[PDB]
Amino acid sequence: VLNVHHRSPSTHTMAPWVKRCFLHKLPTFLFMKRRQDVQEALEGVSFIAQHMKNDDEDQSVVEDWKYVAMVVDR
Amino acid sequence: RQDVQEALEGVSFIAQHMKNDDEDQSVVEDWKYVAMVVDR
Amino acid sequence: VLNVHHRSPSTHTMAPWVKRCFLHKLPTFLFMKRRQDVQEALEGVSFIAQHMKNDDEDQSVVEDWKYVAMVVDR
Amino acid sequence: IKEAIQSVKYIAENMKAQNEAKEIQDDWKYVAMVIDRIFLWVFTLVCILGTAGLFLQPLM
Amino acid sequence: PSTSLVIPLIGEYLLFTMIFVTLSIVITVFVLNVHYRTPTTHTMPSWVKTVF
Fold first, then answer.
1. Which residues 6-65 of C are in CB contact (within 8 Å) with B?
2. Phi-psi category of C14—alpha, beta or left, where left has phi over 0 and alpha has psi -120 to 50?
3. Which positions, given as ranges, span the membrane (chain D)?
């Protein structure tokens, strides 16, 4: 249960059965309850927004792994 | 024009957030140096 | 050799003799080889860029301390 | 005026370089995970083979 | 006893397990050195990109 705490999206991928099992049934079962120069600037700001959104997605998945490890621990 | 006004407030909020973050980082580095002095 | 690994740029100053000794001669000897609302927005973006430049410089110096620790270790 | 746009370009280039460095560090972590798994399987097979061939089989 | 005629199976098993656990720590120090490694201090080779 310590190995499934440090899983990241750059190494592993969460299977759909551990999606649907360790997040809905058992946490409710174990009482958890949860002009040209201006054009390049828009490209840079869009790249910054895409990078921060990808960072938030990876942080959400690693928090999901931490919650799965907490449920298996309990 | 109404869409333009909130972006400047966003930039000002980012500036104030990073300034407060740098002040907190300076204070915690000051605590680390105090620990180093007491240890020596 | 573990003390010199945790030396930050904010609390220590890298002397020129460790520059000339543990970075050039010994990594080759040991085969290492390495409008008042509008105007403040521009000043804020300039401040963000200068702070990221300073952060990159301090990160480079602390990685330089880590490399000095690695050379002394080998 | 142009300095702010060049600064945004600098921020974007810095974040791209940091992303590529993080990719290289993830590759270094993944090759260590691969070496860890292959030696797990090798020592599991050697341990089971030793406890079979040296401990139970002659002593029965 | 300290009879050098034959060795017990349990002492042979203990020696076997001690040898392989020592080889396990000399493997795990290598994988800890491989793990904590950055591109600002080391260059990653080309043959390690295909094999490992």
1. 8, 10-11, 37-38, 40-41, 44-45, 47-48, 51
2. beta
3. 35-53
Q: How far apart are the first and last CA of chain C?
A: 10
Q: What is the 3-state secondary structure (H, E, C) of C1-13?
A: CCCHHHCCCCCCC
How many Å separate Cα C45 from the centre of its chain? 24
Determination method here?
cryo-EM
Q: Provide CB contacts within 8 A for D23, sequence distance 6+.
A: none
Furthest CA-CA distance within chain D:
88
Nearest to A41 among D5, D15, D33 (CB): D5
- Spell C43-69 as b/e; 16+ CB within 10 A means b: ebbebbbeebeeeeeeeebeebbbbbb
**Read out DSSP for chain C?**
--TGGG--TTT----HHHHHIIIIIHHHHTT----HHHHHHHHHHHHHHHHHHHHHHHHHHHHHHHHHHHHHH-
Q: Find the closest chain C residue to B16 by CA distance.
A: C44
Question: Are E48 and D39 within 8 A, CB to CB?
Answer: no
- Tell me the chain D residues in contact with residue C56 when contact means C-beta distances shorter than 8 Å: 14
- Separation of alpha carbons C52 and E6, rounded Å: 71
How many angstroms separate the CA atoms of D24 and E44, rounded? 9
Q: Across the interface, do A40 and D19 touch by the CB < 8 Å criterion?
A: no
**Which value in Å is the resolution of this experimental model?**
3.9
| Chain center to CA of D39 | 14
CA distances E30 to A14, B22, C67, E19, E27, Å, are: 29, 38, 18, 17, 5
